[PDB]
């Protein structure tokens, strides 16, 4: 079964807009999104559709780029580091659930390298 997806808004959490967060949406996320290996990460893992019935028995902090994108669009984050942590959670979940060498892991590894390339330098 699938749990509810992660929240993309929270009225009691303070919002913020920063040059770095704008950049994470306009450049980092929106560029990764177009990568040929982006598709598995563009929405929450669907344990039913993908036939991964144990996914959420194993992964307790789900994250995906669809969620991140919505969060950025909503100014959900306080700062860039909070957003970067979501990306890292997404990649880490993939390495936890799957094994080295798996096609999905090769896709995550590629995206993570591109992600690190693009956040190496952020605006000030």
Give the residues lining the site for ligand 3PF (CB under 6 A).
40-41, 45, 50, 94, 97-98, 104
Q: Which tokens go with 47?
A: 């344990």
Decide whether 24 or 94 has the Cβ nearer to ligand 3PF: 94
Q: State the Cα–Cα distance between residues 75 and 79, nearest whole angstrom.
A: 9
Decide whether 29 or 94 has the Cβ nearer to ligand 3PF: 94
Residues 44 and 62 sit within 8 Å (Cβ to Cβ): yes
Q: How far is the CB of 20 from ligand 3PF (least distance, A)?
A: 26
Distances, alpha carbon 107 to alpha carbons 24, 25, 88, 124, in Å: 20, 21, 14, 30
Q: How far is the CB of 22 from ligand 3PF (least distance, A)?
A: 27
What is the number of the residue whose Cβ is closest to ligand 3PF? 40
């Amino acid at each position: 079964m699938n749990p509810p997806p992660p929240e993309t808004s929270n009225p009691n959490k303070p919002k913020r807009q920063t040059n770095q967060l704008q950049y994470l949406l306009r450049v980092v996320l929106k560029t990764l999104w177009k990568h040929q290996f982006a598709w598995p990460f563009q929405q929450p893992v669907d344990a039913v559709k993908l036939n991964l019935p144990d996914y959420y028995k194993i992964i307790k902090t789900p994250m995906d780029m669809g969620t991140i994108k919505k969060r950025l669009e909503n100014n959900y984050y306080w700062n860039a580091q909070e957003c970067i942590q979501d990306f890292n959670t997404m990649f880490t979940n993939c390495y936890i659930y799957n094994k080295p060498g798996d096609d999905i892991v090769l896709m995550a590894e590629a995206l993570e390298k591109l992600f690190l390339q693009k956040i190496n330098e952020l605006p000030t």
